[PDB]
C-alpha cells in the first residue's frame, strides 16, 4: 500500500463555511494525484491541474 499522511486541519466545505477535520492522504506518483479521505468521502487532486491545486493547497496550508 502507498504510505499515508494524517493531518489535522480546517476545510472550507463551501465558499464561506469552515470545519475542523482530520484527514488521511497519500500521493500516487504513478498518476500524479493526491487522494484524500475526509469523513468517509474520497477526494482526488490532480497535481497537474491548477484548479485542483488551488483546492488542495488551503487544506495543507491550514494544517497543524
Amino acid at each position: 500500500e502507498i504510505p499515508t499522511r494524517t493531518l489535522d486541519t480546517a476545510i472550507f466545505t463551501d465558499a464561506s463555511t469552515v470545519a475542523s477535520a482530520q484527514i488521511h492522504l497519500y500521493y500516487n506518483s504513478n498518476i500524479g494525484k493526491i487522494i484524500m479521505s475526509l469523513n468517509g468521502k474520497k477526494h482526488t487532486f490532480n497535481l497537474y491541474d491548477d484548479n485542483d491545486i488551488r483546492t488542495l493547497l488551503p487544506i495543507l496550508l491550514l494544517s497543524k
Binding site: 472550507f12 463551501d14 465558499a15 464561506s16 493526491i34 497535481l47 488551488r54 493547497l57 496550508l61 491550514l62
Partner: protein, 67 residues
C-alpha cells in the same frame, strides 16, 4: 519528478476577506484559494485561520512538507 516540488513556495494570504495563494510557480498574479466544492474562499475571519512559523512569517508548503 514530483509535481509538488514547484509548489513549495505556496503560502496563504488574506486580501480583506478573500483567501489567496501567493508564490505559485507559473503565476504572474495571486489567485484565489478554492473550497472543496470549487468556489473562491471568502471569509470575514480569514486572518484568524492563517498559520505562522512562530513569527508573522507565513507558513509555506515547504514548511508543511518538512514538518
Amino acid at each position: 519528478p514530483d509535481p509538488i516540488d514547484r509548489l513549495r513556495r505556496a503560502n496563504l494570504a488574506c486580501e480583506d476577506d478573500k483567501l489567496m495563494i501567493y508564490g505559485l510557480p507559473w503565476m504572474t498574479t495571486q489567485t484565489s484559494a478554492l473550497s472543496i466544492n470549487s468556489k473562491p474562499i471568502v471569509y470575514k475571519d480569514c486572518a484568524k485561520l492563517l498559520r505562522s512559523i512562530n513569527g508573522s512569517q507565513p507558513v509555506s508548503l515547504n514548511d508543511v512538507l518538512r514538518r
